Symmetry: D2
Subunit: 237 residues, 4 copies
Amino acid sequence: ADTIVAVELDTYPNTDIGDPSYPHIGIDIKSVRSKKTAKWNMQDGKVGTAHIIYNSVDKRLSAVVSYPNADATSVSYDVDLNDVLPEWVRVGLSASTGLYKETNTILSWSFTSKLKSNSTHQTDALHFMFNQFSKDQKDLILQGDATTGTDGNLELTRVSSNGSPEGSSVGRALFYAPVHIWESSATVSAFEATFAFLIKSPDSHPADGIAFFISNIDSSIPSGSTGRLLGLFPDAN
Amino acid sequence: ADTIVAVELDTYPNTDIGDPSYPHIGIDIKSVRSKKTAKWNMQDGKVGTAHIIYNSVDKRLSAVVSYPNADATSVSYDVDLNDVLPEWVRVGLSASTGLYKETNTILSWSFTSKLKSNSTHQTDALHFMFNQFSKDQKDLILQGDATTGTDGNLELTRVSSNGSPEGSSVGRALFYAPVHIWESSATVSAFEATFAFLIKSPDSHPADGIAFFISNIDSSIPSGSTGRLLGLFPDAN
Amino acid sequence: ADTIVAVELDTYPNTDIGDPSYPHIGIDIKSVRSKKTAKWNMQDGKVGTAHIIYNSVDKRLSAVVSYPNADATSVSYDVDLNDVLPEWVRVGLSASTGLYKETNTILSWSFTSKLKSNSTHQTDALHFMFNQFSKDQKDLILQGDATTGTDGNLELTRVSSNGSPEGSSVGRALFYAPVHIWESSATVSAFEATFAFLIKSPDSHPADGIAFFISNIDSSIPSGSTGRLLGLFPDAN
Amino acid sequence: ADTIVAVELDTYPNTDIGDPSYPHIGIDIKSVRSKKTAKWNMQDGKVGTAHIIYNSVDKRLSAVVSYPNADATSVSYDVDLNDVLPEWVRVGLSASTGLYKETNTILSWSFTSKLKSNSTHQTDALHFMFNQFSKDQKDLILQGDATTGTDGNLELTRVSSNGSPEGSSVGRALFYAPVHIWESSATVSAFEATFAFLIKSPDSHPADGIAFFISNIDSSIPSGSTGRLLGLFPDAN
Ligand SMILES: [Ca+2]
Ligand SMILES: [Ca+2]
Ligand SMILES: [Ca+2]
Ligand SMILES: [Ca+2]
Ligand SMILES: [Mn+2]
Ligand SMILES: [Mn+2]
Ligand SMILES: [Mn+2]
Ligand SMILES: [Mn+2]
């Protein structure tokens, strides 16, 4: 009733769980215990951009977190979303804070996803494009402390009037229209997403990080999703 | 609180209103009293396909209802949706029946729509692709007697087990995610849609017709939307 | 100077090479000796549709040849196009005949391909859409006996005035604009293509088959590309 | 044999022709004598972005040249490209210099274009995406002094090693694949393009300007296309 696949950006390495010793990216299937991990070179206060693709033919969850001038960090995990995700899913954004401070602002957001059938070709599909959120932003489902329009951006985490990334925070947002994972006569399916993000830390010990996650249209933030729980996974591991 | 712009397919010409004397297409702004009209050559039991575009620069509501081998029928009206539609709209499908019988089945359905901002370029946008509806069809909002999956199609109107188009009927359906008409820093906006439809009449006196309409996320079928009221307009004219 | 990756549709099983004992699909890297194979259930005179995807993160050449009502046939091979294809490639269509007769008509043709950079996001990319070829068809590069506009279709192989698939034939066609495989600051690349095809055989012993292939902008049909050589590979194996 | 429709960015107002008295934008059909004009507020050394759309239903050439924080400048002209452009066209970029200096660098470039037929729906079409040009840039046709990869950008005009916009210059570039304006069974056609540009002037008296133009696959720069001739129109007016 509340299951999710997440692609997470980890700034604050919680050794106690199983994350490497520095900032890392990887795939989480069912829990905080990411299945695959990788090391990315944090650039505090710098502009970033994430990417993520997959499909049934191959069924391989892959990611690419890039930085300008800086070199690429990727990770790939083999999994059957067919077996994991609800036939119909929802797409949103999560970011987190707790003891540590950090900014979680989204500049641009893009989502592509299609479904190939038996009939002939070019069956079903959907796209959502973002470069600036509004005070309106009505085809979006925000959770908790997310803020849209702050500075004309999707700000997952709590911010002040001067910047000052707040702590002990948590919220998220998902596109209105559900998504279609797999189907009766579908033999070739696909998903594509990219997203620029902006993490800012006055501290050298930045918060927790960000995260792009897939779950049920019903997905809700659990208890103390705060902290390293990036509001993707309850206390279970 | 319940306003709409509609592109309608009129099979049953109700002289009493203002529709020409044979089947016609045109633009309806606020009421049944379509603003522009045109004559299209009905092909009962044959496969059809509608199209419709517009934008602010130009602000001209235009349409093209085609038939294979058959020649094109188009109509164009000058209007300010900026002035008419809610800043945030919804996209759906309507078809109608009353004293007259006719089929209103959708084979394929496509929706494209984008928003150009000041920042730089390629700001906001969305796409929805359809070639076959499901028993599921969960990212769709159906109204009344619409049926999804019947034969793997979106069937706006009431059908029997042998075909037999039902009469005195009415229903519709809209994509889940709202749409974004105009905005703060948007100076160049656009909308694009095409759709194949299938109207079937055992009778020579076919029902009412079909209709592609834009309204509020709140849009609901009025009283006796049945008949020529194609469930787009209440009794007001 | 003349290298290619091909996704081929094999109707006429030439045991002497290494193809299974019935019609099959698979990946060919450098030669006729396809690297991966699979069994698809031919439906002579019936409408078909092929699909094919891949990318660097994963680097896995995958395919899906479907038939309506009929079940799916797929194959997947792990390869480094980065290491194989010219930084800049060309996209076309090949089909073949020799001792055996068969039809090789294309109804629809679709090509999607993009390149993700370091700068920010949504870097480079291209699309080409086909549902009917012309007597014109000017942004297409046809080779040999291919015919465009015959019946408003791309007909790779030689046809008569009554149908009568010709034999001992060979030709192909590619989109004008070159394609961009990999690049300096590209860390996330992708390719997507689908295509409906129509193979017709008065005989029970149909020709050779079809094939979607990637090569150099310079790609030319070799000697006796005819036969099982599907005009993709010279005599080398 | 050499005809063109152009959307031009005019920095250097040549009163002697018919351009207003300050920088302006407008539509040129057959000649320098733009048919429609409008006033845009130049921002030297600042980042800009142009847009342009049209189609048969409506047949209205429209444009939007925007600047960040700054307000929009648009122009619209009614014309029959069906009657003017070759059934098959080419898409490129032009910029100009002469007595006056100015920079003409392109950051991003985007092209969308489709063709609706009788068959059913979603007939033909093409897309080209740009955010950074290469030393390679092989699916592009550059003319004269255009430079690709200079700083990872398409630089239409002649630049030095320190910047120093050169004078008395002229060149352009077009996408490889031709374009399809109108056709046999096409009743609903469309074209869409946006583009960010960067004009830089050490002087207060900047060169000539930029220009997005449509012509024949054969289009070549005429004599002294230099100057206000923005290399779009020969000496004829
Ligand atoms: Ca952690
Ligand atoms: Ca009527
Ligand atoms: Ca063979
Ligand atoms: Ca001038
Ligand atoms: Mn972790
Ligand atoms: Mn009417
Ligand atoms: Mn073989
Ligand atoms: Mn001028």
